[PDB]
Design brief:
This is part of a larger assembly, with chains A (about 60 residues), B (about 200 residues), C (about 50 residues), D (about 70 residues) and E (about 120 residues). By secondary structure, chain A is α+β, with helices and mostly antiparallel strands. Chain A is built from 1 helix and 3 strands. The radius of gyration of chain A is 15 Å and the shape is extended. Chain D has one helix spanning about 5-10. The chains are: A alpha+beta (about 60), B alpha/beta (about 200), C mainly alpha (about 50), D little secondary structure (about 70), E alpha+beta (about 120). Chains in contact: A-C, B-E. The structure holds 4 RNA strands.
Chain lengths: ~60, ~200, ~50, ~70, ~120
RNA sequence: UAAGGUCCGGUGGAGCCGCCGGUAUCGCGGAUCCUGCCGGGAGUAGCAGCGUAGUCGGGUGAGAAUCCCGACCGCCGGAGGGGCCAGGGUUCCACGGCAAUGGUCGUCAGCCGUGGGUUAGUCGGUCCUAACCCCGCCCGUAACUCGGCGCGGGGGAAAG
RNA sequence: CAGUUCGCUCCCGUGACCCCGGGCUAGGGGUGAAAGGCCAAUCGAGGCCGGAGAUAGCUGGUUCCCGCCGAAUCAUCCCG
RNA sequence: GGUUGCACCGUCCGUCUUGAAACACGGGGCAGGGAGUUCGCGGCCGUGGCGAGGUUAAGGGGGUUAAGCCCCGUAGCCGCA
RNA sequence: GGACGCUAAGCCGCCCGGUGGAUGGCUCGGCUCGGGGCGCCGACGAAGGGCGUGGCAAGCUGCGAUAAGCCCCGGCGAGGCGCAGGCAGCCGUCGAACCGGGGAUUCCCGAAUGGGACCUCCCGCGGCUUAUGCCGCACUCCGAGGGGGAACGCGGGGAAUUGAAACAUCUUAGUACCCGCAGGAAAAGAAAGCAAAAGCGAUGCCGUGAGUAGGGGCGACCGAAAACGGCAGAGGGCAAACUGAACCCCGGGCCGACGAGGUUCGGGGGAUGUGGGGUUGUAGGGCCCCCGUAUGAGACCCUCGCGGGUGAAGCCGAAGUCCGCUGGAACGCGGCGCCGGAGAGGGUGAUAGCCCCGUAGGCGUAAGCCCGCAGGGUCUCGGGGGACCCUGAGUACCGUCGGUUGGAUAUCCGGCGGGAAGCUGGGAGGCAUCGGCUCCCAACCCUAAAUACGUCCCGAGACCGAUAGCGAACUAGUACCGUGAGGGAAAGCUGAAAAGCACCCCGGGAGGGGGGUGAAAAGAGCCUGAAACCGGGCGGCG
């Protein structure tokens, strides 16, 4: 679409995800059951990647 | 460093240069030769020159030349080393000199011979260095005095290292650095009968 | 309501409440020159705030 | 001892530095292409070699025997 | 010649970080000339419990008792080595033990007595 | 010739050179270059436009056109007002202040500082099931935090 | 005033209507009363990071002095 | 040296261009940052050693606090058709 | 007419004060390299994360409602109470702080596991006790496992921009990226090998062989190995043939130094075969016969006393702080003097061998390691006689199609189809087949040592130094932004000691000014204090 979108919707209001407790990010999806910052509610592993994208952020965060 | 931040384009349309800065804060850059925290044109490598071969013949001739400079009074004085014994250079002393490793007893033989005057120079710090190089270390040094060459009593002698500028060696492990430090020739040597006899023989 | 604050979230909010205080005097004497007040002071119109 | 930069100095305001124009020095097209850049090629991408003879070719033949059956006498 | 730290920056880092027991050693001061010979002990770690003389710095020839030994600021306070404050107080004057020489040894710790007689000599 | 160097006077209050042989993240006038600091524009425009509000006494105070009290006059009037859903999170209340903040102003304030205020068998959440979702087991896939079937179980409404 | 505003005017206002909350459909795929429109200020094929310092025959720019010699802008070939 | 009058001359700077004082492009001003580096291989050159020969690599012994230099190792390469 | 008689505003230069933060010196930080260490941990409830906790606490750091901590041992031992140099207050010298090992408690969340869940909450058993206190339990194996871990290692899956001046084989590349998985190295590894036909006998890695053979629009490009010199070394055990229970495991007791070794008692495996035998190569496979005869000289292990070194990161360690002078302070100048198995580098009010940490030298032990020294236990072996023994299958090998590699007729592996032989036999030596010659036994398994890493500790610099080097030297991956994935800064310096300004005048004034402040032009992001720029003034012009 077309620039000028920010007066139309009172959005963000009520989320579409919530505060995790495996990482505390605001991505534990209440309409599924999946964490998209580290995996939880569908998973017993943390995400395992050699990108690094996550692994690096996490180490610095830790 | 200098690929630490992604580098994304500010573009044209607003009348400034099209030269990339960053995403979130336009205030720094990367993958440019400017910026805090960045690369230049090409950083310094670990791969830089650090070995230089020299041929066995070529190295040996250098040793011969540097020891020849020592036996000429004029070169020794030019380097700054001042000697009482004008007609005699280098000095050979009796074989007993090695065994002595009282710092004070081995000092006295030097004083008499007139070769303490070089050691006074090294008492004065002349390896003093200006600039901020003090921060990295390796200043306030002593000047290289005479060279004491022994046959044995190990490679270092325990009554000939304490003295200023007196650096100890053996004739099996002799080197161009000891003969003419800095590529300035004209540094005194002092022999022991067993070293002099063993150097007569050529090793390579 | 506002909906709604579980038991742990009142604790978090409470941590957040503490931070919005200026640094007390006794610290600055103890350091012996000085510690500026330093941004963790909270507004309520101007504060939107990821979790 | 001497460096490449030393030899260039900072120069005359040539702004190229011994390769003439600053528009024929900006990449790999400038070279005429990277690497050898064709030889037996039907296009004359690289036409003429580096010697006057134009281009000199490869893909001629004559066997080498197995290394074990050969002997080159000494 | 000697095992060294030739970077001054690491040498300083060593100096700051030291264990508490080692910090006492930096706070040692030469025994006066009569004593130094008599025990054969070069120096010993200055404490509260001793008398000391300041011979260098602004008071010279002054002697006084050690009030405090501070290991973070690496200075010691002696009574009558003092400053006068311009708000009408008399406040202590810190000086390092390196300017100072320890005029008398007063022993009231049993380890310390074992050392002076025996090991330290 | 020069690139450049040296000396003097003031400031400064601890480090600094020359000579020779080495070395390179080694010398800037420009890149619609990057960054910091600063001037002109200007003390201009903007602080008028939409249904357009103050004004006179008196109180307080270092200071009052816009803080408060009294009087008078408006604007809004099923809706620039009242109660709530979402959201905010202390903005609530109280007391003390004016350097900062309020398109001017300020003794006022949601600003700054410090204390204090939300007390539930009988309200609602929780619970029920809905659209629909997820987990285990079987199986697949080389394999999976992937995939759905067939079984078994749980979850699922702050306007039902 | 506003990264889409203001006034007036206009169309619809029981309907194939509008509207809330939950859930569902995801990238050569969806969704589309069909504009190549839309899918989080990005759609003739979204954003993110890695490959990656992609490549250019193409624009801009490339830093201290002095001394000596001092041009060619023609010729052949080439998807040139 | 600061500033200024007179006589005379004098259309920036850099880039682009066949031609720029330009109605071609770029610059508000000052400071700081700011662009020829490394490796391999080939072709050149200068110097130096040795000579129909030349050169050793890897390694361990050795020496040293470590290490370099010093000695051994000629595997292997090149030239002598 | 000329004259300075008044030329404002303003232009140019300089000067003085401010602004500003450049510049130099300064650096408890980076960066790179060398050596060694660390070399796994977790449902026996990890790591990670959250929220509290201190006298005052805003962040950091440390801990868990026993909350900047508690206990024990050994070591060092006379002042402490983290970053933070305030006051109050607290404890120790009758042994703290600190260091090493070990222990207690170690909330909630998280593999998280009974269930759900914005980091909270509720429950069904069984032990338990006064009891709800309190302890164990309800995901998946067998009668032990998830998950984590800095990279490295193993096995699979597997791009494209780019190059070829375009473009499709080829190239990029077996790279990026994805999944499973092990260790402190991994894996390979004790011969159906090599093939200079001669010589060798497990296997890694480094140098070399070599940009050589070979591949390839025969274009660009790609690319070995045998061998050599080194390094380090170590070999064996199953199935079967033939014997046929001669055997093995588990829990409890006893004996013995808990041990080495042996016994008994309740169960299980095993006659669909434990054990004996035998194991690359036919060993003669069997059964025999002479003798020493598998006890075993050794070789290995275990127990325990001694001795030696190592190991609680800790001890001990020489010699000027003398005189005169300058200065705020000597580390300066002159003079005298001192030590060395010991003139490194920091520090101290400045430029210190002898003022101090230290240093050359030597030394220490508990848990723990190594060796021999007192005892006990286990244990390999050796000859010639007939019929030579299925002695390892969808294998060998071939057929069809690919993937891949230098692999070329001659790489390696997979899928689909066919399909042997019995050491009397088979395989290999770079085309097929047949012959000679030589080497060598696939279809069973493990394996120490030499070789990879960079979490960490130390040492080092022709390395960098606060608009540089890590994004970050200073509460940083912090502040901050974004639905999220993800993105991401800036902020270093008083002085010897704070003496960090009493007391006084003025000012509404907490600001500022006057005076007193060793230096204050060191008076509060305060060492130094550039330029652009602003004000006034001076000199010239107008």
């Amino acid at each position: 679409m077309g620039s000028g979108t920010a007066t139309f919707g009172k959005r963000n209001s009520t989320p579409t995800h919530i505060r995790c407790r495996r990482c505390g990010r605001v991505s534990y999806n209440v309409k599924k059951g999946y964490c998209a910052a580290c995996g939880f509610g569908r998973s017993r592993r943390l995400r395992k990647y050699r990108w690094s994208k996550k692994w690096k952020k996490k180490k610095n965060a830790h | 460093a200098g690929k630490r931040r992604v580098t994304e384009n500010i573009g044209k349309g607003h009348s400034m240069a099209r030269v990339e800065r960053l995403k979130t804060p336009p205030r720094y850059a990367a993958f440019v030769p400017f910026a805090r925290g960045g690369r230049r044109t090409h950083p310094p490598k670990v791969e830089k020159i650090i070995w230089e071969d020299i041929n066995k013949k070529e190295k040996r001739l250098a040793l011969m030349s540097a020891i020849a400079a020592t036996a000429n009074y004029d070169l020794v004085r030019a380097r700054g080393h001042i000697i009482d014994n004008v007609p005699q250079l280098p000095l050979i002393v009796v074989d007993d000199l090695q065994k002595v490793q009282k710092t004070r007893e081995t000092r006295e033989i030097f004083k008499k011979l007139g070769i303490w005057d070089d050691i006074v120079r090294a008492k004065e710090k002349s390896g003093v260095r200006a600039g901020k190089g003090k921060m990295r270390g390796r200043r306030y040094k002593k000047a290289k005095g005479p060279l004491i060459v022994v046959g044995k009593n190990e490679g270092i002698v325990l009554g000939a290292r304490n003295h200023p500028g007196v650096d100890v060696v053996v004739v099996d492990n002799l080197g161009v650095e000891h003969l003419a430090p800095g590529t300035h020739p004209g540094r005194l040597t002092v022999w022991t009968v067993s070293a002099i006899e063993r150097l007569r023989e050529l090793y390579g | 309501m506002a909906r709604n604050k579980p038991l742990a979230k009142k604790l978090r909010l409470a941590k957040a409440l503490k931070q919005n205080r200026r640094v007390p005097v006794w610290v600055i004497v103890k350091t012996n020159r000085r510690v500026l007040t330093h941004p963790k002071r909270r507004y309520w119109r101007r504060t939107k705030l990821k979790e | 001892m001497i460096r490449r930069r030393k030899k260039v100095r900072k120069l005359r305001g040539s702004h190229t530095h011994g390769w003439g124009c600053k528009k024929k020095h900006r990449g790999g097209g400038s070279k005429g292409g990277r690497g050898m850049a064709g030889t037996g090629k039907r296009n004359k991408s690289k036409w003429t070699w580096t010697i006057k003879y134009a281009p000199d070719h490869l893909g001629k033949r004559g066997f080498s025997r197995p290394p074990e059956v050969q002997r080159e006498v000494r | 010649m000697k095992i060294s730290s030739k970077q001054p920056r690491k040498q300083r880092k060593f100096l700051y970080n030291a264990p508490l027991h080692v910090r006492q050693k930096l706070m040692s001061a030469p025994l006066s000339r009569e004593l130094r010979e008599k025990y054969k002990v070069r120096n010993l770690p200055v404490r509260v419990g001793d008398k000391v003389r300041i011979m260098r710095g602004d008071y010279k020839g002054h002697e006084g008792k050690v009030v405090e030994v501070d290991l973070k600021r690496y200075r010691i306070y002696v009574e009558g080595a003092t400053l006068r404050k311009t708000n009408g107080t008399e406040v202590f004057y810190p000086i390092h033990p390196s300017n100072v020489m320890i005029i008398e040894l007063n022993l009231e710790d049993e380890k310390r007595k074992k050392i002076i007689e025996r090991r330290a000599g």
